[PDB]
Amino acid sequence: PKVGRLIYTAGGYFRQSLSYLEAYNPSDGTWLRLADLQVPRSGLAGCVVGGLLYAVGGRNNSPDGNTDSSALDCYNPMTNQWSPCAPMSVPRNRIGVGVIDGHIYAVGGSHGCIHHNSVERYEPERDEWHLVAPMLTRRIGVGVAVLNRLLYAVGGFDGTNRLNSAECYYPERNEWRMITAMNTIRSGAGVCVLHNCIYAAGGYDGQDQLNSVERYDVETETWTFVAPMKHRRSALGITVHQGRIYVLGGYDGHTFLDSVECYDPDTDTWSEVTRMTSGRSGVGVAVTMEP
Ligand SMILES: Cc1ccc([C@@H](NC(=O)[C@@H](F)c2ccc(Cl)cc2)[C@@H](C)C(=O)O)cc1OCC(C)(C)C#N
């Protein structure tokens, strides 16, 4: 842990794709409004490498069109500016991303009616992307997280069925292997890592948005439900900060939520902690130092 670290929410969707970049400070309850993305995007992912925030993929649903994004953009909190980076090989909307040893893995997502099982890896110093082994399953709305330098792709939608399946990427073998399937089918879940487990919170089972939350213990290979969130949500933002899980916004079939809930694993409870400045879903979230 270190002092100064904010939860950054980029992009999102409410009626159309959004360009907002806003940062929450758990220490004081405040929100900062920062530089807008150069292009509005929903269905993107956020991550951090080297103190810099990256916005990856997504789609621009605007009045004039609906364009899937191959973009990678980098925000520097020291300048409050976005800078374009090299684009991915293919547009990826409803993407999932994970960082291993300073490299960004872009996983799955859609391009029109195409559902991608393809995965590619970004090298920041070289500003280059290269394809890695594809997943065993095509997954859009996929949740991705990294634990112990292994990358997990959880749930999603293959174009016909929402999935309870999950798989793991072993970088030294450039190989994907299926792990135990979740107890619940989830597309658009928030996926993150806390302690020695991969959590999957919320999402959509094709009928309902979910409030259940389950975690995969990488040693025992089981999925166990924990306490459910107060509010059902899908297409939520998620991150971990100071040993707690934060879920931001999402859609529950009636409202684009502004609710932010925080999970304490020691008490197995969720608390409501703040509200976003407006309700939105399909955002990209990550933590880095304050600007
Ligand atoms: C980021 C994201 C991930 C997963 C999904 C999945 N749908 C949901 O999760 C619905 F529960 C839902 C329905 C309506 C909304 Cl508005 C949100 C979610 C989608 C793959 C599926 O299984 O069909 C949508 C997503 O983004 C939709 C968008 C851009 C409109 C937003 N946000």
XYZ file of C-alpha atoms and ligand atoms in Angstrom:
323
model
C 0.000 0.000 0.000
C 1.019 3.655 -0.528
C -0.620 7.048 0.253
C -2.168 9.160 -2.546
C -3.833 6.426 -4.643
C -7.136 7.115 -6.381
C -9.724 4.910 -8.119
C -9.970 6.146 -11.720
C -13.093 5.509 -13.834
C -12.786 6.037 -17.594
C -15.497 6.126 -20.221
C -18.750 4.256 -19.818
C -22.281 4.309 -21.160
C -25.501 6.172 -20.382
C -27.632 6.663 -23.536
C -24.369 6.809 -25.542
C -20.678 6.188 -24.912
C -18.989 8.618 -22.522
C -15.615 10.412 -22.415
C -15.454 10.984 -18.624
C -12.268 10.422 -16.618
C -13.092 10.822 -12.894
C -11.035 9.805 -9.850
C -12.347 8.873 -6.371
C -10.286 9.314 -3.210
C -11.326 6.788 -0.575
C -9.422 8.735 2.065
C -11.664 11.856 1.808
C -14.748 10.859 -0.207
C -14.038 13.293 -3.057
C -14.257 12.948 -6.827
C -11.954 14.776 -9.255
C -13.001 15.459 -12.847
C -9.965 14.981 -15.087
C -9.159 15.206 -18.818
C -11.824 13.625 -21.028
C -10.842 10.759 -23.323
C -10.077 11.919 -26.889
C -12.858 9.547 -28.124
C -15.967 8.507 -26.101
C -15.902 4.795 -25.320
C -18.039 2.188 -23.552
C -17.087 -1.438 -23.102
C -13.400 -0.527 -22.574
C -10.985 -1.681 -19.936
C -8.581 0.269 -17.776
C -5.253 -0.757 -16.318
C -2.042 0.747 -14.958
C 1.583 0.117 -15.794
C 4.397 2.243 -14.412
C 2.093 4.768 -12.817
C 0.313 5.459 -16.145
C -3.378 4.695 -16.787
C -4.330 2.937 -20.025
C -7.739 2.869 -21.712
C -8.046 -0.142 -23.984
C -10.618 -0.998 -26.663
C -14.331 -0.409 -26.302
C -16.796 1.092 -28.786
C -17.932 4.661 -29.576
C -21.756 4.602 -29.617
C -22.395 8.238 -30.655
C -25.200 10.041 -32.549
C -23.205 9.702 -35.836
C -22.117 6.050 -35.570
C -21.114 2.947 -33.609
C -17.448 2.201 -34.058
C -15.523 -0.572 -32.294
C -12.176 0.577 -30.952
C -8.703 -0.846 -31.457
C -7.284 2.101 -29.529
C -4.828 2.148 -26.666
C -4.558 5.550 -24.934
C -2.370 6.482 -21.986
C -3.168 9.041 -19.278
C -0.362 10.532 -17.221
C -1.580 11.885 -13.875
C 1.504 14.139 -13.702
C 0.268 16.070 -16.838
C -3.482 15.439 -16.889
C -3.080 14.507 -20.578
C -4.020 11.533 -22.741
C -1.579 10.301 -25.393
C -2.337 7.729 -28.116
C -0.307 4.548 -28.215
C 0.043 1.843 -30.877
C -3.393 0.278 -31.632
C -4.303 -3.322 -31.189
C -4.469 -5.652 -34.186
C -8.259 -5.702 -34.147
C -11.113 -3.674 -32.613
C -12.231 -5.137 -29.283
C -15.470 -3.982 -27.627
C -16.612 -5.418 -24.241
C -12.931 -6.355 -23.755
C -11.093 -7.603 -20.640
C -7.442 -6.707 -19.838
C -4.820 -7.922 -17.369
C -1.264 -6.778 -16.613
C 1.596 -9.286 -16.162
C 5.189 -8.054 -15.521
C 4.545 -4.642 -17.058
C 2.776 -5.995 -20.172
C -0.910 -5.440 -21.031
C -2.927 -8.417 -22.263
C -6.034 -7.578 -24.269
C -8.500 -10.431 -24.201
C -11.492 -11.293 -26.328
C -14.198 -8.716 -27.046
C -16.390 -8.167 -30.138
C -15.988 -6.494 -33.530
C -19.471 -6.283 -35.014
C -20.879 -9.854 -34.987
C -17.352 -11.318 -34.572
C -16.702 -12.777 -31.096
C -12.979 -12.964 -30.413
C -11.056 -15.755 -28.704
C -7.851 -13.886 -29.829
C -5.491 -12.347 -27.224
C -2.625 -9.850 -27.826
C 0.098 -8.413 -25.555
C 1.339 -4.804 -25.331
C 4.969 -3.855 -24.556
C 4.993 -0.222 -23.248
C 8.677 0.543 -23.670
C 8.684 -0.741 -27.288
C 5.117 0.588 -27.991
C 4.175 -2.617 -29.814
C 1.373 -5.216 -29.670
C 1.844 -8.892 -30.627
C -0.640 -11.757 -30.702
C -0.335 -14.538 -28.148
C -2.144 -17.826 -27.992
C -5.923 -17.472 -28.373
C -8.387 -18.587 -25.683
C -10.159 -21.954 -25.950
C -13.476 -20.041 -25.910
C -14.698 -16.912 -27.720
C -15.629 -14.432 -25.001
C -17.081 -10.950 -25.058
C -18.037 -9.182 -21.875
C -15.201 -11.209 -20.334
C -13.793 -10.427 -16.880
C -9.993 -10.665 -16.660
C -7.644 -10.609 -13.694
C -4.094 -11.609 -12.865
C -2.906 -13.483 -9.802
C 0.613 -14.875 -9.260
C 1.600 -13.934 -12.840
C -1.141 -16.050 -14.366
C -3.999 -14.450 -16.418
C -7.628 -15.528 -15.927
C -10.522 -15.010 -18.383
C -13.853 -15.495 -16.658
C -17.339 -15.848 -18.089
C -18.599 -13.660 -20.902
C -20.769 -14.349 -23.937
C -19.801 -16.383 -27.031
C -22.531 -14.883 -29.239
C -25.077 -17.674 -28.456
C -24.698 -18.446 -24.729
C -23.554 -16.558 -21.660
C -20.858 -18.579 -19.928
C -20.024 -19.929 -16.452
C -16.688 -21.209 -17.884
C -13.248 -19.766 -17.155
C -9.691 -20.343 -18.323
C -6.162 -19.456 -17.389
C -3.137 -18.384 -19.464
C 0.331 -19.706 -18.489
C 2.755 -17.286 -20.091
C 5.868 -19.529 -20.082
C 3.869 -22.134 -22.135
C 1.858 -19.571 -24.223
C -1.085 -21.844 -23.420
C -4.654 -21.489 -22.157
C -6.225 -24.238 -19.991
C -9.820 -24.396 -18.683
C -10.283 -24.023 -14.947
C -13.249 -25.090 -12.854
C -16.405 -23.442 -14.090
C -18.172 -20.878 -11.909
C -21.326 -21.760 -10.042
C -23.220 -19.102 -12.006
C -23.310 -18.056 -15.667
C -21.968 -14.493 -15.857
C -21.466 -12.079 -18.732
C -20.299 -8.598 -17.815
C -19.135 -9.525 -14.294
C -16.558 -7.496 -12.448
C -13.480 -9.683 -12.031
C -10.552 -8.925 -9.718
C -7.997 -10.571 -7.440
C -8.044 -10.415 -3.643
C -5.599 -12.471 -1.613
C -5.348 -15.881 -3.305
C -8.705 -15.801 -5.109
C -10.218 -14.535 -8.291
C -13.555 -12.837 -7.587
C -16.446 -12.600 -10.006
C -19.070 -10.070 -8.891
C -22.414 -9.487 -10.557
C -22.939 -9.801 -14.278
C -25.786 -11.105 -16.435
C -26.956 -14.681 -16.875
C -29.102 -13.854 -19.985
C -32.247 -13.341 -17.911
C -31.257 -11.340 -14.842
C -28.479 -9.014 -13.679
C -26.873 -10.535 -10.582
C -25.920 -9.482 -7.084
C -24.140 -12.761 -6.228
C -20.355 -12.828 -5.898
C -18.125 -15.910 -6.001
C -14.372 -16.462 -5.691
C -12.003 -19.045 -7.211
C -9.273 -20.262 -4.880
C -6.355 -20.995 -7.218
C -4.937 -23.712 -4.879
C -8.192 -25.649 -4.193
C -9.722 -24.958 -7.612
C -13.124 -24.316 -6.117
C -15.572 -21.485 -6.568
C -17.316 -20.338 -3.368
C -20.023 -17.697 -2.969
C -19.302 -14.850 -0.603
C -21.775 -12.216 0.631
C -23.839 -10.759 -2.240
C -23.665 -7.093 -3.190
C -26.565 -4.912 -2.026
C -27.380 -4.000 -5.640
C -27.640 -6.298 -8.673
C -25.459 -5.001 -11.476
C -23.870 -6.009 -14.784
C -21.240 -4.185 -16.878
C -19.857 -2.780 -13.599
C -16.390 -1.309 -12.979
C -14.259 -3.038 -10.357
C -10.933 -2.690 -8.607
C -9.133 -3.622 -5.428
C -7.666 -1.005 -3.114
C -6.272 -1.508 0.374
C -7.470 -5.096 0.598
C -11.068 -4.274 -0.330
C -13.092 -4.738 -3.528
C -14.817 -1.658 -5.009
C -17.631 -2.138 -7.550
C -18.680 0.985 -9.498
C -21.945 1.548 -11.386
C -23.374 -0.910 -13.861
C -26.863 -1.614 -15.166
C -29.561 -3.552 -13.350
C -32.402 -3.582 -15.967
C -33.970 -0.361 -14.618
C -31.277 2.159 -13.843
C -27.693 2.981 -14.738
C -26.338 2.818 -11.256
C -24.243 5.500 -9.597
C -23.756 3.206 -6.537
C -20.218 2.286 -5.404
C -20.023 -0.643 -2.964
C -16.943 -1.866 -1.064
C -16.357 -5.460 0.090
C -14.399 -6.260 3.251
C -13.194 -9.865 3.049
C -12.403 -10.041 6.801
C -16.055 -9.356 7.749
C -17.567 -10.733 4.474
C -19.712 -7.594 4.158
C -20.404 -4.975 1.509
C -20.908 -1.306 2.406
C -22.083 1.577 0.212
C -19.222 4.103 0.116
C -19.896 6.855 -2.392
C -21.841 7.514 -5.528
C -20.362 8.321 -8.874
C -21.167 11.813 -10.190
C -23.706 10.239 -12.559
C -25.010 6.706 -13.204
C -23.127 4.768 -15.911
C -22.120 1.227 -16.987
C -19.405 -0.314 -19.237
C -16.550 1.697 -17.640
C -12.835 0.889 -17.292
C -11.392 1.217 -13.759
C -7.874 1.159 -12.287
C -5.874 2.571 -9.393
C -2.828 4.781 -9.531
C -1.384 7.902 -7.869
C -3.319 11.116 -7.676
C -2.686 13.735 -10.403
C -19.363 -3.957 -20.908
C -20.398 -5.094 -21.133
C -20.120 -6.342 -20.754
C -21.087 -7.379 -20.892
C -22.289 -7.090 -21.494
C -23.290 -8.198 -21.632
N -24.650 -7.744 -21.295
C -24.960 -7.369 -20.048
O -24.138 -7.502 -19.098
C -26.357 -6.846 -19.832
F -26.664 -7.076 -18.432
C -26.412 -5.374 -20.123
C -27.497 -4.875 -20.865
C -27.535 -3.474 -21.043
C -26.574 -2.668 -20.485
Cl -26.740 -0.970 -20.754
C -25.523 -3.151 -19.768
C -25.503 -4.487 -19.583
C -23.364 -8.765 -23.063
C -21.967 -9.242 -23.536
C -24.319 -9.902 -23.105
O -24.236 -10.932 -22.412
O -25.315 -9.796 -23.961
C -22.529 -5.790 -21.969
C -21.563 -4.817 -21.792
O -21.807 -3.529 -22.176
C -23.022 -3.136 -22.811
C -23.023 -1.613 -22.887
C -21.898 -1.023 -23.732
C -24.358 -1.104 -23.461
C -22.840 -1.069 -21.541
N -22.779 -0.670 -20.515
